[PDB]
């Protein structure tokens, strides 16, 4: 038994975790459960956006984070740095930028740190940002040449990608991200009103179809007159 109010899910607001929230949500046997001594839902602890990341990088300058779009190859210094934006291509699980000279073009790999820094410089503000949790049981320091670090980072990225009638009621009786199916919904902070049959079926609540398209209230005006 729980003392909290019993409610129904009226909206599902998809979004994306912030690094702060993942650390805040995390409780760490801590995932009888050592955290609640219970009924236990499961306590958290602490690849699909590569195309989106590439598009964002092409659509914005990669030095000042100011909107330029993909075809543009110059910052158009309006506030700007004037650097010529590279042509970004997706190779494996990495992004490679190429600069054309003013004679093969210069090429280098845009480090994930560089991409993150630029994204943080870019001007949903609450639920899903471009810059942006271990499932619970129920579900460089020294030396390290650049080659070794790059190989380790590639292996870690590859591993991450791979990892990712019993009642009288029934007796008598006898367009939303969730409805379509989710990554896109989280990126755009899509709000699902849960007005469709699919959403209610997923959440296990009475659907607004047939006997559920209305509400049965209780009237006291008739009750007093019935005695």
């Amino acid at each position: 038994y729980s003392s909290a109010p019993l409610r129904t899910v009226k909206e599902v607001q998809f979004g994306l975790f912030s690094p702060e929230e993942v650390r805040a949500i995390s409780v760490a046997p801590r995932l009888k459960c050592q955290t609640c001594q219970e009924e236990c839902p499961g306590h958290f602890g602490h690849v699909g956006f590569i195309a989106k990341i590439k598009k964002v990088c092409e659509c914005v300058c990669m030095h000042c984070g100011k909107l330029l779009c993909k075809t543009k190859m110059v910052c158009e210094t309006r506030g700007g740095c004037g650097n010529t934006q590279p042509t970004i291509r997706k190779d494996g699980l990495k992004l490679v930028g190429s600069w054309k000279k003013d004679d093969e073009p210069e090429l280098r790999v845009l480090s994930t740190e560089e991409i993150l820094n630029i994204f943080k410089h870019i001007s949903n503000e609450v639920f899903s940002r471009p810059e942006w949790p271990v499932p619970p049981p129920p579900v460089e320091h020294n030396g390290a040449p650049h080659h070794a670090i790059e190989e380790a980072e590639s292996l870690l990225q590859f591993h991450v990608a791979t990892y990712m009638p019993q009642s009288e009621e029934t007796r008598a009786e006898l367009t939303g991200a969730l409805m379509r199916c989710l990554f896109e919904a989280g990126a755009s902070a899509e709000l699902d009103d849960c007005r469709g049959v699919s959403e209610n079926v997923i959440l296990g609540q009475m659907a607004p179809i047939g006997t559920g398209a209305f509400d049965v209230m209780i009237d006291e005006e008739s009750l007093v007159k019935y005695m």
Binding site: S167, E168, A172, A213, D219, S222
Partner: protein, 55 residues
């Protein structure tokens, strides 16, 4: 509130109430009898407009 399948739910809803020892003003058979005599004290909130089962 605008100023002034339903049968299946009302019959089942009142049948459950009767099975739970609710007063009878006239379990599925009892609910059907109440509906026939218009003695079901509920209002259907069509989505809104509130309509009494009696009317």
């Amino acid at each position: 509130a605008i100023p002034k399948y339903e049968r299946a739910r009302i019959l089942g809803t009142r049948a459950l109430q009767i099975s739970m020892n609710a007063p009878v003003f006239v379990p599925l058979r009892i609910a059907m009898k109440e509906l026939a005599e218009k003695k079901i004290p509920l209002v259907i909130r069509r989505y809104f407009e509130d309509w009494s089962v009696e009317e």
